[model samples]
Target: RKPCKLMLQVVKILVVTVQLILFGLSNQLVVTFREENTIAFRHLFLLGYSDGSDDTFAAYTQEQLYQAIFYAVDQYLILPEISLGRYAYVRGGGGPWANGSALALCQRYYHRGHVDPANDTFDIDPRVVTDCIQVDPPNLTLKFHKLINVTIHFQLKTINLQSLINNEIPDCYTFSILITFDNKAHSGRIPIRLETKTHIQECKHPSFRLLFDVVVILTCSLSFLLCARSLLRGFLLQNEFVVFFVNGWYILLVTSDVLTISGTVMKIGIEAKNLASYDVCSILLGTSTLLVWVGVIRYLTFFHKYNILIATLRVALPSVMRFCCCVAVIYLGYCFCGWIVLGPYHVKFRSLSMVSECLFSLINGDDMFVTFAAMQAQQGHSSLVWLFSQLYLYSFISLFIYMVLSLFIALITGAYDTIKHPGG
Candidate 1:
């Protein structure tokens, strides 16, 4: 029975090690997927431009906008839709842009001032311009001064190059294609850009990432089940409501497992590229990873040396918190005073948040001379303000770094000494 119990403990540790490795592997796969997918989309949308400079995104003339849209539309017609090798061209240029025919071009142009540009379109009908623009809520007429700017939204879909190059998975993608042009341009070299909010539905992975994800899902589920059973047992044993509170670590464990399972499942479930889901999945995975690592301390407490650290922390926590609160009151007082008094004279004290950060930096002795030098130079206008600044800096630096911080360390060290030598 002793041998079996020891074996179980060893196995538990090994299983935890395996789970950590699997979690990291799965996390890497998700990160890589997102990274490569984003790069591919950026590459495609930016039209294979090497440098992401200001010149690449410069404004466009009317003729240049027309030429650019014509070129993009040609490329949009060729991309394969969801399935492998079969291009969208077979089905009359595929999706919304084609709409079962040639590319449907729409435009919305802003005009300058209350005076209608009837003279500008004397030959063309005003209804053509009115009807040409697309508004969300029907017939929402926009009258404004920014006239030379025209917006063209050409919605299109394409392949995910990451899956294409690696596994040959036919992943299709689409985005909010915003190509805006200002006709009052110096040259015809118009800027073509996209408002890249992507929504894609196509799967990837010919191998390992899928299998790893499944294992993680299975492990997390089993862990959650075990945690739930433990929690249930506590309730069944006539435990008080505080049993749930006492079993809060179990709650964290359960939560971590749930999030891991959810994120893992959603990652494969989509098999489709949804950038929004990528964000959600990453957030879930990151938070789960954080909780899981924090839970490591629970096991560490099994050892006497490690348990001492935990015990010392527990004893010190109350006094430390109280000390922090007292220090915080004084800190906030300085923050408010610095913000109000030195704000106009010093760049560091321009805002309340800035004042807090600047003071905190001063407490840590970072950029001390720079702050002093800048303040000294700027406060030359008023002798009294300069005097105030010197007093403020000197007092703050002396009190916090030299006096307050030393006391803080002493408090923690004193707790440690008491715990270490309880007889004294």
Candidate 2:
């Protein structure tokens, strides 16, 4: 307990250090994630224009929504998502209104609007309330025929954390209604797809887009230098440690750093289409390259007098490899079938690569079982998603995890004995 607490206290101080030396030299080691660096919010607008120049682009004519393009016209798609790390101002103020009743938190809108002690009040980001969405109301009407332009504007309240903490009274959820269509009760919410262009130019915020660039550059620099030094030393003097470092791990590690840094620059900077190829080469290929380091590290058994490890690698690894291959063939066959069967409903099953990634993540302790469980049992003419899940669990986990994993361990133990005490 003391040691645990002591380490926690130590970590409290040590947590801030930027470990440039140890971790900086590898692309596989990343401090922060790099994703679409779009503006937090931009072009958040809704507009429609058909090919013809009739001015009014009305939605009344189209009864069936088939092939009818409702353009997601908003800057929301053009910008990246951002969470205000700091407090965004909201409406409600202090919490003494807390009846402490759960009812206070319920989403109830009334004509007499405003947050009170009885209302469950909270703050909004305030940023979402924008000058971007413009609408002139009261004269608004729903027309079936095309109009020059049609737009609805509703100002949003600020979402803030402090309002939650203080329990402030918020003013009305302000809404100005223009008008509704022909005696029909129409209900449709504005659907926005945020970050269509995940990366945008012009966003100081723009080039700073690749948040992980500095970390990556420093890592590659340090790793490359260290590796070069080791290789040079290994060639000059056959120092054991130097020799150990001059292998595939060093090679791939260096290549990974170089390729990742280069790919990040060339792909994201130069062109968008290059992204797919970059993922194949840099991300997927880099992952495979890193996985090979396992074999390289195991190669050290010869140096460490861990001959049993080498022998175990020879005996058990080959068997495991064979087992995995056979399973893979069966696995692929199933993945394809599921892809064909479930592709309509589940997006993960649309392609071999996507399906394989999901299954692999599931095998490696990702929580997609709930997703698999939610899959439709039987569609028009397939076996069953539920049945497939059951078979996979029992076959892989029951046999591979419990039985085969134990057998693999036994094989390693046997090889240990073979190395320690000469085998027949």
Candidate 3:
């Protein structure tokens, strides 16, 4: 089956390519939908009603927090029924659609999307606002008359969208306008979303997504079966310590196939549960995609023309490790010295880790003049630290860039040359 084996290889490559392409398209669709909705929610929270005045409740003070809560409810009446933002222009003007002549009030609990009418309805009733609009801890307060808690979140629960004339009313239940205020003037103003919108819900090209999902299911299953078969054969016949245990890439191939399948299934299930699975599903699929692309290198090892790189790395591995260790010891010494000495004078060397990255950048010939000029500017006001910094930078750059890097390259090239000319 030599010819048949080659056919399988070609088919597998094509299958993986198609799998990746479909995954990329579906991933982009889901990611873009989330980001677009994020921006839409931002407009409502930051630029309410599109009146051009800054309605953003920058909760800078306790007084501001109280006022913002009142304003959030006040502006709720002006929010567009089903528009992206103020300018998009949905029907029923721009505001929460009030049912009949009843007082327009909506409330939602943080961490949950249960929508029930407020008992008070903001119509001069004695019912407390907390009962109508619940926060995360339930103890979290919003009424200005009795404010004691450290943190609180205000969310709009239900808006009458039954009469609205649109393709679909934006899922207002998922939108949460959270305004947080702590003591000493620290605050946050952003809409924390409950669930992400899918292409099906958004009336996007839903049929096309079905096509991509089918491709993923078919290709991923094929890849999974191939890898799993190889793994089981290697495990049963080959020595556990030598052949099967040593083959890590084979294991990774099967692992990635499993992840890809699970992610695709989870992505499809999101339509049913669109509850809260975007981050997990996306991360799983992304890592699987990365591993699948990396696995392509395994096929390259079969061709003599492409095998030289693997051979070169194998031969140079020992020399490279020793060379890198020697360079790293000196690099760490410089990092510590620069961090302790120039930390107060230079912004880059303020911390040991920062100094490490800064020196690495300088060794790579980045921000060299900026570092020098910054030290010079600080020199007029500081001590001999500037001179010491210049000495540190110059010596480190010369050693790592000019000497160490050249030697490392020489080691690899020497191995490559030996591989290229076996007689030599």
Taking the candidates one at a time, how many backbone clashes does each contain? 1, 22, 1
Question: What residue pairs are clashing in model 1?
Answer: 110-147
Residue-wise lDDT of candidate 2 within 226-303, one digit each (tens)?
556655664566666567722344455455445444544543554466545644544433443343344345443445
Candidate 2: segments with Cα more than 4 A from true spot = 1-253, 256-315, 340-348, 357-407, 410-424
Ranking by TM-score: 3, 1, 2
TM-score of each: 0.57, 0.37, 0.59
Model 3 scores a TM of 0.59
In order, the Cα lDDT scores of the candidates are 0.53, 0.36, 0.49
Residue-wise C-alpha lDDT for candidate 3, range 60-106, written one tens digit per residue: 44455555445544444455554544322122211233222111223
Best by lDDT: 1
- Candidate 1, after superposition: displacement of residue 105 in Å? 11
lDDT of 3: 0.49
